[PDB]
Amino acid sequence: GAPATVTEQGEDITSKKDRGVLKIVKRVGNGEETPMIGDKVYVHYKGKLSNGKKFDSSHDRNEPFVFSLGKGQVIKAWDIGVATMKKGEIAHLLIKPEYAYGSAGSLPKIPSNATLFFEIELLDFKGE
Numbered sequence: 001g002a003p004a005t006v007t008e009q010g011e012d013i014t015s016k017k018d019r020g021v022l023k024i025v026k027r028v029g030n031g032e033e034t035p036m037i038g039d040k041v042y043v044h045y046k047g048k049l050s051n052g053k054k055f056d057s058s059h060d061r062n063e064p065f066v067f068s069l070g071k072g073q074v075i076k077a078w079d080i081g082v083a084t085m086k087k088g089e090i091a092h093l094l095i096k097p098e099y100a101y102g103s104a105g106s107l108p109k110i111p112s113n114a115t116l117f118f119e120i121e122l123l124d125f126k127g128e
């Protein structure tokens with residue numbers, strides 16, 4: 001990913017406009033529609049710590065990742081970010097700890113005050 005390019009060119013998609021979630025579109029999607037709260041969302045993704053010491057990918061489990069949009073099942077940055085996505089889009093998100101795991105993190109994976117970077121491909125979404 002290009003966290004300088006996201007820092008430099010990224011859209012602030014936070015309510016508070018505190019630059020806590022910055023988005024680039026890397027590939028434009030084919031849908032006009034973005035998902036609604038409660039929609040079952042299907043993605044592929046890869047994520048990392050900004051320090052480059054831990055990694056994760058949906059492919060590590062050989063299946064798309066599924067969550068409920070806007071239900072707090074995943075970090076706030078995801079609920080915020082995926083809500084802005086069309087089917088087929090690939091976006092990069094640079095995420096400050098206030099929109100991820102904050103001061104206590106989630107050890108061992110997530111240190112205190114960790115900045116995260118994700119690539120998300122929105123595959124599909126379906127109501128309730």
Ligand SMILES: COc1ccc(CC[C@H]2OC(=O)[C@@H]3CCCCN3C(=O)[C@@H](C3CCCCC3)c3cc(OC)c(OC)c(c3)OC/C=C/COc3cccc2c3)cc1OC
Nearest residue numbers: 047048049054055056065072073074075078106109110116
């Ligand atoms: C205290 O608050 C929480 C603590 C822990 C969780 C569980 C992790 C949750 O993961 C996420 O929300 C984000 C976004 C969706 C993909 C995974 N993810 C991560 O933060 C990755 C992380 C990316 C950066 C490099 C290190 C790994 C992550 C974090 C974990 O714990 C903090 C994981 O252990 C559970 C982890 C994957 O394991 C693989 C799981 C992947 C997807 O399944 C999830 C299902 C529900 C919630 C999350 C993940 C959720 C929390 O609140 C929402």
